């Protein structure tokens, strides 16, 4: 059982609150910008004012940088983030050197793996054609998904020449060796699909990955901090941790 | 079994050949622009005497002046050049023989279309994306058969809009969007799936081919049904 | 905001009853066979006595057919069942002469819709071979599913012949034309997926329904309820509600 | 251009000779067990004869061994064979000590690549169901494919206590984490398709392998040529060529 902070309550920290109560967990205060009524748990403006916490569950953005500009706690911190990182990984940082601190900007242990059977994937299918394929639900306007680019980075520090190729309609042109197909495709309430092609002489491999629900980076901070609570301070990833 | 008339004997009508003989067929003739082969040589469709059919996969140089003829025989026509003059005389033809005519040879690509044509009205909330794979030496983008299929969706849905390239479009999906995305690489033969997307669950119609046999042995399947059928024009959905 | 009468209160009419009140729907009242004391609505054993009910919806078994049994209520049903239907079926025809009665196996638009499309596909490929393959979180016990089985059952009203094949590592037995090979996958929380394969010569024809969350069902008679409250008397199926 | 000797010239070495052919490699000769005039190609009878050989491709079998035999000949050897093995890999490690030998039973590179990546996916995901399937034509008798053992084997030599599962119809079990459900489908022409599903909490990751032709064979055995030209004498398989 660990007792747990959540900074920020959000629709992330919301799912970490349902899933930590179903593991045995207890959400013991919440640090938000706006203390929002119907907020079902003690509420507080400084992590030293939350005694008992084991850990803090972060699911940033600019406005919730303050609890961590507070100099009296010494507390496991589980950190995820999007966009802006270096003003919060400059306080990470300066934070991991008194107490054990995790950072990752996508909180999926599964996704995390994947990146590395891609990066063992990709030496042994270097004659292999590469298209990747990502799917999401109808609501999301930016295309490609973060993960699809995060992907497409582990095969370029891989590669000597890579070539994005966002649309081949009308495009007309024959297809060289270093393109990599980006195919985004939307619609439903598709959580999240990324599928890696290698495309060989008569013979393909894929490697797929499809989430089911964003509980899953919910799961991934908390599964975190239960292995975080024992470390040594310093800094961690899903590399390290 | 069936005497079949090749009209050109490029790499699909050998395909045909292999296939028909297979079958207990024989292949009692071949019209060709510059003959080799180890077939009988023809000029005219008139000339090859106990033909059944003919199965064409060729070009409208080879194929335009044997139609402007004065023939009797079944015809199962694959050419896809310059479609608008080549059903004009298939038409006219029609009133004097049985006349198939398909763009795609291909039996499971027209169960797909049918499947296709059943699925929509019946998932109306439902987002489609297409997508097709296929060989890296494919250039043209998106397939023919992927605009077969978006085709039969635009009969059975108002509004239709295809969407090529998301990157930094920065627009929200319309329910009357249809994504389109090809997938080139390897030796792929072709694959082609419709996603239908609702909430919380997904439908995905998917057909795989895996070689370029699958049309040469729909082309003859068609003569195999056609030699069957009264005067009249063809195709897949009423052969 | 309707009133809804909850018949049965297992795992699916706790989710109807957590997704109604999140849109604004009551719950005022639940037919359970043995009530339970961890069941938060008021317990009633007569559809009649249920003061103020707009409609029912009930996720049956033979266990819970018993407040269909009485021939002193009007009001809008809507019935799923996934075991054996006949006796269920009967009740309802009767029932939908004085009062609005839906019917779904699942309840799911989707799986309806899947179940129409394999009969249009099964009379097109007369000469594929068929197998059928579903995937199902590790906590599921019976195989194959009974959406698997539904499918099944649709193949054999449209075939002379079926034999479903089982396990092919005990019989070593060369594949027969009139075989339907049966697969059941196990694992994680997949919520629910079902392939139909048809395989001829050279080429493939594979037809998938996936679940992302039992949701689609929860909401899925929640929407034949709201839908069904405004119908006239009868009997409806997805086909003509 | 790789000078390429054929040691037999059944189905796959005709395959080999096409293949070779489109990629500008050339065929200098054939060993054949019962020369055919209809092998369009140089006949020999023993290694030593042929002129200007770089390497020899030996789809092999009990009468194809007796090239091996002779001991006036030094060139790279691409070697597979079914079933009994001894005689032949006693032979091939005798010439393994004069020249580059290379033995592979199965010479697709996409399969080698899969087992690969498979191995460095178990590690990662030890808290991820695993699920074997494979699919076959209809002509395929034995089940599971040779393949699929081999990808359990790989689970088997990172796990412990793993378990097959091979039917779960009427079963009525719970899935536990040591089981593998192994899956066998059989219809139409299908070359050869091989999944493995890791399946976690609220995510899943595939990894499939789909043969288009059994080219990848041919094609295995021509791409493992190209590199053991460049090999000192040896004994060779995928793992360490």
């Given at each position: 059982?660990?007792?747990?902070?959540?900074?920020?309550?959000?629709?992330?920290?919301?799912?970490?609150?349902?899933?930590?109560?179903?593991?045995?967990?207890?959400?013991?205060?919440?640090?938000?910008?706006?203390?929002?009524?119907?907020?079902?748990?003690?509420?507080?403006?400084?992590?030293?004012?939350?005694?008992?916490?084991?850990?803090?569950i972060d699911?940033?953005?600019?406005?919730?940088?303050?609890?961590?500009?507070?100099?009296?706690?010494?507390?496991?911190?589980?950190?995820?983030?999007?966009?802006?990182?270096?003003?919060?990984?400059?306080?990470?940082?300066?934070?991991?050197?008194?107490?054990?601190?995790?950072?990752?900007?996508?909180?999926?242990?599964?996704?995390?793996?994947?990146?590395?059977?891609?990066?063992?994937?990709?030496?042994?299918?270097?004659?292999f054609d590469?298209?990747?394929?990502?799917?999401?639900?109808?609501?999301?306007?930016?295309?490609?998904?973060?993960?699809?680019?995060?992907?497409?980075?582990?095969?370029?520090?891989?590669?000597?020449?890579?070539?994005?190729?966002?649309?081949?309609?009308?495009?007309?042109?024959?297809?060289?060796?270093?393109?990599?197909?980006?195919?985004?495709?939307?619609?439903?309430?598709?959580?999240?699909?990324?599928?890696?092609?290698?495309?060989?002489?008569?013979?393909?491999?894929?490697?797929?990955?499809?989430?089911?629900?964003?509980?899953?980076?919910?799961?991934?901070?908390?599964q975190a901090?239960?292995?975080?609570?024992?470390?040594?301070?310093?800094?961690?990833?899903?590399?390290?941790?």
């Amino acid at each position: 059982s660990m007792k747990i902070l959540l900074i920020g309550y959000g629709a992330m920290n919301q799912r970490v609150a349902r899933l930590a109560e179903e593991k045995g967990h207890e959400i013991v205060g919440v640090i938000e910008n706006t203390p929002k009524a119907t907020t079902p748990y003690q509420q507080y403006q400084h992590i030293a004012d939350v005694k008992g916490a084991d850990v803090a569950i972060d699911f940033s953005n600019p406005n919730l940088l303050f609890p961590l500009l507070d100099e009296d706690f010494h507390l496991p911190l589980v950190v995820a983030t999007t966009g802006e990182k270096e003003k919060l990984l400059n306080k990470l940082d300066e934070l991991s050197q008194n107490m054990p601190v995790f950072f990752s900007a996508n909180m999926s242990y599964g996704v995390h793996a994947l990146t590395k059977i891609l990066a063992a994937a990709v030496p042994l299918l270097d004659d292999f054609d590469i298209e990747l394929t990502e799917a999401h639900h109808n609501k999301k306007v930016d295309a490609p998904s973060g993960t699809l680019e995060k992907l497409y980075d582990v095969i370029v520090s891989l590669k000597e020449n890579v070539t994005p190729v966002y649309d081949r309609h009308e495009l007309n042109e024959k297809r060289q060796p270093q393109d990599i197909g980006i195919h985004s495709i939307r619609g439903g309430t598709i959580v999240g699909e990324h599928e890696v092609l290698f495309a060989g002489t008569d013979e393909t491999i894929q490697i797929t990955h499809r989430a089911q629900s964003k509980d899953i980076f919910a799961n991934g901070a908390i599964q975190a901090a239960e292995r975080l609570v024992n470390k040594p301070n310093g800094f961690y990833t899903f590399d390290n941790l």
